Amino acid sequence: TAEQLLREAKERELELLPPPPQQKITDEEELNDYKLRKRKTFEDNIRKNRTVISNWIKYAQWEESLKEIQRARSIYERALDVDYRNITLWLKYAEMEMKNRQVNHARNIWDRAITTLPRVNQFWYKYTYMEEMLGNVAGARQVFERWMEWQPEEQAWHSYINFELRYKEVDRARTIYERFVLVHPDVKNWIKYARFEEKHAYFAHARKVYERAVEFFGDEHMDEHLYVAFAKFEENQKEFERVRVIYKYALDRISKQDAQELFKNYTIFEKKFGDRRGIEDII
Amino acid sequence: AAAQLRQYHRLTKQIKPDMETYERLREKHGEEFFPTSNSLLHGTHVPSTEEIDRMVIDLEKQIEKRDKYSRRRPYNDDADIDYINERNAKFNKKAERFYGKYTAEIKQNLERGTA
Amino acid sequence: AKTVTKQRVESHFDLELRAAVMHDILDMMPEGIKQNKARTILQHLSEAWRCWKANIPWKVPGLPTPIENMILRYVKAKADWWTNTAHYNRERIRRGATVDKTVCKKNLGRLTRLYLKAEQERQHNYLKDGPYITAEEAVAVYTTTVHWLESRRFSPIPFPPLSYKHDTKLLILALERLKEAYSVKSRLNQSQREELGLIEQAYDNPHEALSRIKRHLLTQRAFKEVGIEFMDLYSHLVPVYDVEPLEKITDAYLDQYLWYEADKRRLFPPWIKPADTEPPPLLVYKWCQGINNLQDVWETSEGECNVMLESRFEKMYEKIDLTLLNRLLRLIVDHNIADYMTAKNNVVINYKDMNHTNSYGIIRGLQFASFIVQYYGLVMDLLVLGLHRASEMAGPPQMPNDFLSFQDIATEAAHPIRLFCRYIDRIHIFFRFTADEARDLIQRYLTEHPDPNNENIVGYNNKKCWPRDARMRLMKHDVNLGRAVFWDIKNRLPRSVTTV
Amino acid sequence: LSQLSKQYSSRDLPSHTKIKYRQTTQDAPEEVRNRDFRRELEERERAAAREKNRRRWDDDVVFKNCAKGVDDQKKDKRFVNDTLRSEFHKKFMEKYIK
Amino acid sequence: VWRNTEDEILKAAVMKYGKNQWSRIASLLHRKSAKQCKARWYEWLDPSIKKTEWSREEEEKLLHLAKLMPTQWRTIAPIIGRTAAQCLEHYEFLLDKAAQRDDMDEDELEMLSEARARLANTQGKKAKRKAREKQLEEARRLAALQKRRELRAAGIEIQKKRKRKRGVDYNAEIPFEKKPALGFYDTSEENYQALDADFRKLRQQDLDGELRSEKEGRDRKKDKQHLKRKKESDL
Amino acid sequence: WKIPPCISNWKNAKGYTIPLDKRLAADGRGLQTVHINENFAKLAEALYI
RNA sequence: GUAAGAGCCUCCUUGAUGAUGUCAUACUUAUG
RNA sequence: CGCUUCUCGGCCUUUUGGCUAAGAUCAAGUGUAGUAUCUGUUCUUAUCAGUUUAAUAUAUAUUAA
Incomplete structure (x- = not known):
C-alpha cells in the first residue's frame, strides 16, 4: 500500500506548473493580439495534420466565439471545403452556422448539403430541424420531394407523415401515406394506414384498402398481415360476417396454417367474442 | 420492427445504433416536446401556394425575430441535453493512475478482464 | 525520390504494409465506427511485431476474428519478408562478401532467433510425448551397457570423500583452469565481476567453497535458467552458453572430479578422442604408421580390400531424453552426479528478450559434456563394432590393447575390420574385405539397393581436391564400396539416433 | 503551367528514342486475330499431357536392421506454404546450425 | 536477501x-x-x-510423474501446473522423507519514490525542455508584452515588432480574412441585408471588457472541488 | 465488432499505470502441447526391471 | 567537448505562521 | 395516483501515433563548490477616535440639539 500510495502522492505532485491567468482582456487591442497569437497556434495545430478533426472543431468553437461571423465563416468554410465525405462534420458546421443570428446562410447551407451527399441521416435530420425552425409548408414540400426522390424510408417516412399530419390537416398526409405505403408495401404500413384511418373516422376506404392491399400482398400466406387487419376492423365494427370470412380464409392458409399461435389466438379471440360456449366452438 | 403509432410513453433505446438512433429519438423527442402553434393565423397567411411540393419560391420573408428566438430556444435545449453525459463518480481506492489515459486503460482493462 | 534501398527498403515495406492494411481494415466492417479503426493499427501492428518476433501467440480476447485473421495472414507474409531475405543474407554472408558489422551480425542474430524458435519448436512439440523412445533399442542398449561395463570391470565411485591432497590439488587446479580461461580484465560487466569475487572467495576459503559445492551439487537441484549465444563464424552457428558463476565453479569441481577420477580409474577405449597429446602427430603417426604397420595393408595380391570410413558425429544434443543419462550415467558414474548433471541440461534457454525452455538437449558446454559425449560415442561405438571387435580392442584386463594393435596378428584376424576410432566429433575406420565377404555383403546390399545398374555418388564419393588427378575414376568395386558404406549404416543402424 | 522548367538532372537524358514495333516473326496482330491458339494449345497440352513417363561378423552385432525401406517419407519435390522449416529451411538451418 | x-x-x-x-x-x-x-x-x-497450500489429491500425480521424470524437473514443472521447481523438488523430498520415516531502507525508499516519479517523468528531456520553453516563453512574453503595454499606455512613440517576413506565427497571418474563405450563394441571388444583419449581430457578440475565457481550467478546478468535498457525513 | 485494448508487448513509455492485466498475456501462456505418452513410462519400467 | 535558434550593430466575493549550524546519503562541472 | 421543480443513485460511448540487431549495451578509483530531511526558544490582534443630522457660502468654513 505504501508503493501505490507513494505513486499517488508522487503522481499528484508530478503536475507541471499551474496556469498563469493574469491580465485577462486588458490594454485594449492587446487582447486582439493575444487572440492573434491563439489563432496562430490553432492555425499551426490545424497545419500539423490536414486530417485533424478535433483541432478543426476547437477552431470552430473558439472561432464562432471570438471571430464573430466573418472569420468564423472562414473556419467553417475552410474546414467544410476541405471535407467532402464524413458529412457528420458538415452537420457540426451546419449546427455552428445554425446558432448564428442569420440562419439564412445556414438554411441555404442545409439545402447545399441536400444537393450534397444526403447520407439519409443528416438530410432527413437536418431537414426536420429546418422545417421545425420555419417554412412548414415549404420544408415539408422539399423534404417530401427529396424523400420521394432517392429511395423510400421507414421511421423517417412515417415520422414525416406523422409530423405533416399533426401540423395542419391529414388530407394530404393520407395521400402521401398511400404513396409511401404503395412504394414499399408491408404489414406494418397497412397497420399504420389502418390505425390513422381508424382515428380518421371513415373506414370505408380503410376496409376497401385493407382488402385490396391484402389481395395485392398475398404470396404464400396472410398470417399477421390480413388476419390482424381483419380482426381490427372486425372487432372495431362488430361484424360477424367479416369474422367468419376471416376464419374461413385463415383455415385455407398453407405452411401449417402459417403461424401456429397467431391464427390460434386470433381464432380463439374471434371465436370467444362472437359465440364460443359449447357445441361448434367446443369441437 | 414497429413502424408508427399515435401515443407517447417511456422506452429504453440508448443502444449501439448511436447516430441514427439518437437522431431519430432526438427528432421524435423534439417534435413531441413542441406542440402545435398559431398556424391557423398562418392559415390566414396560407393562400393559394401551399401544396405542389416542388416549390416556386422557397424563401419569401421567413417570419420575424420571434421565430428567431423560438428557433434559438431548442438550440440551447439541445446544448443543455448535450451537456449531460456522465458524472464525476470518483473516490480513493486501489492504486493510482496517470491523467485520463490510465483511467481509460483501466476501463478497457476491466472490459477485457470480464468476458 | 524514395526507395533508397540499404535498410530503408524495409521501412517502406512496413509503411506500405500498414497502408493497404488500413484500407482493408476500413473495408472489413460495413459500418462499425470511424475512430475505432485507427486504434486497431496499434494493436494489430504491435501484436504482429511481438507475435512473429517472439514465441507468444499474441491472442487478443474478444478480438475481431476476421480482422485478426487478415492481419495474421499479412503478418505471416511480413514474416516471410524477414525469412527469405534472411536466407539471402546468410548466403551473402558465408558465400557472399560480408558488409560492415550491423547488417551482418544483425541478420546472423535474426537467424539465431529462428534457430532458437526451431529448437524450441521441436523441443516443446516433438519432445513432449513421443520423442522416438524406441523401447526395444533402449533395452538393447541397456544390455549393451550391461555386458559392456561387465566385461570392462570399472568402478562407479560417485565422489571422492576428500581422500588425499589430490582432491584439494584438483580443486586448486580446477579453480586455476576456470580462472585461467575466464581471467581477463577489460570493461565487461557484473558477469566477470561475479567471477572475480567467486575466484577470490574460492581461493580464500578452499574448504568452505569445496564443501559448499559438494553439498550444493550433491543436494540442491539445478540453478536458475542460464543463457546462450551463437556467433557468426562462417560455420554452423557458434554454439555457446552463458552460465552462472555458481554452476561454473560447480562445473570446475565436477569436471575435475569425473576427469581426474576417470583418469585414476582409467576408463576409456584405446581408440578415442585426444587425451594428453597433440592431435596432428597422434592421428599422423597413429593412422599413418599403424596403417602402414598392418600385415598386407598396402600389398594385396587378390581378394583383399581395405575400407577407410571417416564419419563425423551428428546432433550431440539429439538424445532429447534424460533417461539415457539416468540409467547409463547413473549406474556408470553416480546417482547424484547424473542427477544434478541431467538437471543442468533442463535449464531454460534465454536469448535476448525471448525465453525458450528446452530440456531435450544438453548445454553447448558443461563440466561432464566431454565425458558425456565420450560415453555416448563410446557405447554407440561398440554398437557397430560389437562385443567381438570391441573385445579384441579391449585386450587383457591388466594391460589393455595398444592403439594400433592388440595381440600379435590376431587383432586383424579376429576383427574383419582392421581398425577404427572416434576423435571428438569426427571418426575413422579401416577394414579388410574378403572377395567372398565383399561379394556376399555386396550381393545383400546390392539386393537392398533398388536399381539394376545406375549408381549415383551414394554414401561415399567425390574425393578431388588434394589428389586431383591421382584419385580413382570409378569401378565396380567402388560401387561395392558404396554397398560397404550401406553395410556400415546397416551394421550400426540405431533405431532412433543421430546417424551418419 | 508554362513554368517549372529550369535545370535538368541525370537519368533524364534522351533514351530509347526509337521504339520497337512488333515484328511478323514474333507476334503479328492479324495472325493473332486469325490465330488457331485455342486448338493449338489444346493440341500442345494434348501432347505434353499425352506423353509423360520418366557371416559371424554380422551375427556378432547386438542390433539388426533398423532403418530400411524408408525413402519417399521425405518428399523429393514439395512446395510448402510455411516458410518456417518445410524442406528448404530444414536443410538450411541444419547446415547453418550444428 | x-x-x-x-x-x-x-x-x-x-x-x-x-x-x-x-x-x-x-x-x-x-x-x-x-x-x-x-x-x-x-x-x-x-x-x-500459486504459493498457497497445495492439493493432496492432485499431488499424487506428481509422484508417479516423478517416477517417470527423474531429473528433468523443468520439463515436469508446467505439467504439475504449480511450477516452482524448487518447491516441487522440496515437496518430493518431504514426501520421500515422510514415506521413509514410517539507513539503507530509507535510501531504497527514496530511490523507489524517485523511480516511480521518474516513471511518471517518462515524457523525457525533450518534453521537459518543451515545458521549460513554454513556461519561459510565456513569462518572457508576459514581461515583454507587460512593459510594452506599460510604454504604449503612456507614450505614443513605438516601433513595430521585428522583421515582418514570416515570423513565429502563421506566415503573413493577421487574422482578417486569414486563409481562403471561398464564398457561398443561396439561389441565383445576392443577399445583402441578411449579411448586414449577420455582421451587426457579429459586432454585437464581441464586446470590450475584462475576463478570461478558458475550458480545461474550470474543469480541473471543478474536479478538485468535487474531490475535496462531495458528500462525506460518513454513516 | 470493436477495438480491444493493447497491453504487454514492448514500448509503453506512455500510460505507465498498469493495474495488472498486462502479464495475463493470452490463456495460460501455452498448453500441454503433445502432453505425454506411454513410451517414456514403459521405457522407465524397462529401466527399472 | 557542439550541431541549432534570438534582438539591440461609469460599480465587487468562501481567511491554515517566522530568524540562531555541523555528519551516512542523492544530483550537477571541459581543474586529475 | 398523474404533472412540474429540486436532491441522491445506476448503465452506454470518454482513443498508448513508425521500423531494423531485447533497436545496442550496463557501477561504483580519489578530489572542490552548491542544493536536498529532522530537534530542546516565543503567541495574537476585533483597535487609532476627531458622531451624527439639517441649512447657507466657495472637500473646507460658520450656525442650531
Whole structure:
C-alpha cells in the first residue's frame, strides 16, 4: 500500500506548473493580439495534420466565439471545403452556422448539403430541424420531394407523415401515406394506414384498402398481415360476417396454417367474442 | 420492427445504433416536446401556394425575430441535453493512475478482464 | 525520390504494409465506427511485431476474428519478408562478401532467433510425448551397457570423500583452469565481476567453497535458467552458453572430479578422442604408421580390400531424453552426479528478450559434456563394432590393447575390420574385405539397393581436391564400396539416433 | 503551367528514342486475330499431357536392421506454404546450425 | 536477501516496466541483479504461481510423474501446473522423507519514490525542455508584452515588432480574412441585408471588457472541488 | 465488432499505470502441447526391471 | 567537448505562521 | 395516483501515433563548490477616535440639539 500510495502522492505532485491567468482582456487591442497569437497556434495545430478533426472543431468553437461571423465563416468554410465525405462534420458546421443570428446562410447551407451527399441521416435530420425552425409548408414540400426522390424510408417516412399530419390537416398526409405505403408495401404500413384511418373516422376506404392491399400482398400466406387487419376492423365494427370470412380464409392458409399461435389466438379471440360456449366452438 | 403509432410513453433505446438512433429519438423527442402553434393565423397567411411540393419560391420573408428566438430556444435545449453525459463518480481506492489515459486503460482493462 | 534501398527498403515495406492494411481494415466492417479503426493499427501492428518476433501467440480476447485473421495472414507474409531475405543474407554472408558489422551480425542474430524458435519448436512439440523412445533399442542398449561395463570391470565411485591432497590439488587446479580461461580484465560487466569475487572467495576459503559445492551439487537441484549465444563464424552457428558463476565453479569441481577420477580409474577405449597429446602427430603417426604397420595393408595380391570410413558425429544434443543419462550415467558414474548433471541440461534457454525452455538437449558446454559425449560415442561405438571387435580392442584386463594393435596378428584376424576410432566429433575406420565377404555383403546390399545398374555418388564419393588427378575414376568395386558404406549404416543402424 | 522548367538532372537524358514495333516473326496482330491458339494449345497440352513417363561378423552385432525401406517419407519435390522449416529451411538451418 | 521492499518495488517496476525489461528494475533495485530479479520475480513475485497450500489429491500425480521424470524437473514443472521447481523438488523430498520415516531502507525508499516519479517523468528531456520553453516563453512574453503595454499606455512613440517576413506565427497571418474563405450563394441571388444583419449581430457578440475565457481550467478546478468535498457525513 | 485494448508487448513509455492485466498475456501462456505418452513410462519400467 | 535558434550593430466575493549550524546519503562541472 | 421543480443513485460511448540487431549495451578509483530531511526558544490582534443630522457660502468654513 505504501508503493501505490507513494505513486499517488508522487503522481499528484508530478503536475507541471499551474496556469498563469493574469491580465485577462486588458490594454485594449492587446487582447486582439493575444487572440492573434491563439489563432496562430490553432492555425499551426490545424497545419500539423490536414486530417485533424478535433483541432478543426476547437477552431470552430473558439472561432464562432471570438471571430464573430466573418472569420468564423472562414473556419467553417475552410474546414467544410476541405471535407467532402464524413458529412457528420458538415452537420457540426451546419449546427455552428445554425446558432448564428442569420440562419439564412445556414438554411441555404442545409439545402447545399441536400444537393450534397444526403447520407439519409443528416438530410432527413437536418431537414426536420429546418422545417421545425420555419417554412412548414415549404420544408415539408422539399423534404417530401427529396424523400420521394432517392429511395423510400421507414421511421423517417412515417415520422414525416406523422409530423405533416399533426401540423395542419391529414388530407394530404393520407395521400402521401398511400404513396409511401404503395412504394414499399408491408404489414406494418397497412397497420399504420389502418390505425390513422381508424382515428380518421371513415373506414370505408380503410376496409376497401385493407382488402385490396391484402389481395395485392398475398404470396404464400396472410398470417399477421390480413388476419390482424381483419380482426381490427372486425372487432372495431362488430361484424360477424367479416369474422367468419376471416376464419374461413385463415383455415385455407398453407405452411401449417402459417403461424401456429397467431391464427390460434386470433381464432380463439374471434371465436370467444362472437359465440364460443359449447357445441361448434367446443369441437 | 414497429413502424408508427399515435401515443407517447417511456422506452429504453440508448443502444449501439448511436447516430441514427439518437437522431431519430432526438427528432421524435423534439417534435413531441413542441406542440402545435398559431398556424391557423398562418392559415390566414396560407393562400393559394401551399401544396405542389416542388416549390416556386422557397424563401419569401421567413417570419420575424420571434421565430428567431423560438428557433434559438431548442438550440440551447439541445446544448443543455448535450451537456449531460456522465458524472464525476470518483473516490480513493486501489492504486493510482496517470491523467485520463490510465483511467481509460483501466476501463478497457476491466472490459477485457470480464468476458 | 524514395526507395533508397540499404535498410530503408524495409521501412517502406512496413509503411506500405500498414497502408493497404488500413484500407482493408476500413473495408472489413460495413459500418462499425470511424475512430475505432485507427486504434486497431496499434494493436494489430504491435501484436504482429511481438507475435512473429517472439514465441507468444499474441491472442487478443474478444478480438475481431476476421480482422485478426487478415492481419495474421499479412503478418505471416511480413514474416516471410524477414525469412527469405534472411536466407539471402546468410548466403551473402558465408558465400557472399560480408558488409560492415550491423547488417551482418544483425541478420546472423535474426537467424539465431529462428534457430532458437526451431529448437524450441521441436523441443516443446516433438519432445513432449513421443520423442522416438524406441523401447526395444533402449533395452538393447541397456544390455549393451550391461555386458559392456561387465566385461570392462570399472568402478562407479560417485565422489571422492576428500581422500588425499589430490582432491584439494584438483580443486586448486580446477579453480586455476576456470580462472585461467575466464581471467581477463577489460570493461565487461557484473558477469566477470561475479567471477572475480567467486575466484577470490574460492581461493580464500578452499574448504568452505569445496564443501559448499559438494553439498550444493550433491543436494540442491539445478540453478536458475542460464543463457546462450551463437556467433557468426562462417560455420554452423557458434554454439555457446552463458552460465552462472555458481554452476561454473560447480562445473570446475565436477569436471575435475569425473576427469581426474576417470583418469585414476582409467576408463576409456584405446581408440578415442585426444587425451594428453597433440592431435596432428597422434592421428599422423597413429593412422599413418599403424596403417602402414598392418600385415598386407598396402600389398594385396587378390581378394583383399581395405575400407577407410571417416564419419563425423551428428546432433550431440539429439538424445532429447534424460533417461539415457539416468540409467547409463547413473549406474556408470553416480546417482547424484547424473542427477544434478541431467538437471543442468533442463535449464531454460534465454536469448535476448525471448525465453525458450528446452530440456531435450544438453548445454553447448558443461563440466561432464566431454565425458558425456565420450560415453555416448563410446557405447554407440561398440554398437557397430560389437562385443567381438570391441573385445579384441579391449585386450587383457591388466594391460589393455595398444592403439594400433592388440595381440600379435590376431587383432586383424579376429576383427574383419582392421581398425577404427572416434576423435571428438569426427571418426575413422579401416577394414579388410574378403572377395567372398565383399561379394556376399555386396550381393545383400546390392539386393537392398533398388536399381539394376545406375549408381549415383551414394554414401561415399567425390574425393578431388588434394589428389586431383591421382584419385580413382570409378569401378565396380567402388560401387561395392558404396554397398560397404550401406553395410556400415546397416551394421550400426540405431533405431532412433543421430546417424551418419 | 508554362513554368517549372529550369535545370535538368541525370537519368533524364534522351533514351530509347526509337521504339520497337512488333515484328511478323514474333507476334503479328492479324495472325493473332486469325490465330488457331485455342486448338493449338489444346493440341500442345494434348501432347505434353499425352506423353509423360520418366557371416559371424554380422551375427556378432547386438542390433539388426533398423532403418530400411524408408525413402519417399521425405518428399523429393514439395512446395510448402510455411516458410518456417518445410524442406528448404530444414536443410538450411541444419547446415547453418550444428 | 530479497526483502519486502525489494518485492514491492519489484512489483511496481514490473507494472510500469513489464517482463520484457530486466536490467531496468535491476538499476532501480540498486545492488540487485537483472538475472536475480527475473529469476526471483518469475519464480516468486509472479502472481501466476500459486504459493498457497497445495492439493493432496492432485499431488499424487506428481509422484508417479516423478517416477517417470527423474531429473528433468523443468520439463515436469508446467505439467504439475504449480511450477516452482524448487518447491516441487522440496515437496518430493518431504514426501520421500515422510514415506521413509514410517539507513539503507530509507535510501531504497527514496530511490523507489524517485523511480516511480521518474516513471511518471517518462515524457523525457525533450518534453521537459518543451515545458521549460513554454513556461519561459510565456513569462518572457508576459514581461515583454507587460512593459510594452506599460510604454504604449503612456507614450505614443513605438516601433513595430521585428522583421515582418514570416515570423513565429502563421506566415503573413493577421487574422482578417486569414486563409481562403471561398464564398457561398443561396439561389441565383445576392443577399445583402441578411449579411448586414449577420455582421451587426457579429459586432454585437464581441464586446470590450475584462475576463478570461478558458475550458480545461474550470474543469480541473471543478474536479478538485468535487474531490475535496462531495458528500462525506460518513454513516 | 470493436477495438480491444493493447497491453504487454514492448514500448509503453506512455500510460505507465498498469493495474495488472498486462502479464495475463493470452490463456495460460501455452498448453500441454503433445502432453505425454506411454513410451517414456514403459521405457522407465524397462529401466527399472 | 557542439550541431541549432534570438534582438539591440461609469460599480465587487468562501481567511491554515517566522530568524540562531555541523555528519551516512542523492544530483550537477571541459581543474586529475 | 398523474404533472412540474429540486436532491441522491445506476448503465452506454470518454482513443498508448513508425521500423531494423531485447533497436545496442550496463557501477561504483580519489578530489572542490552548491542544493536536498529532522530537534530542546516565543503567541495574537476585533483597535487609532476627531458622531451624527439639517441649512447657507466657495472637500473646507460658520450656525442650531
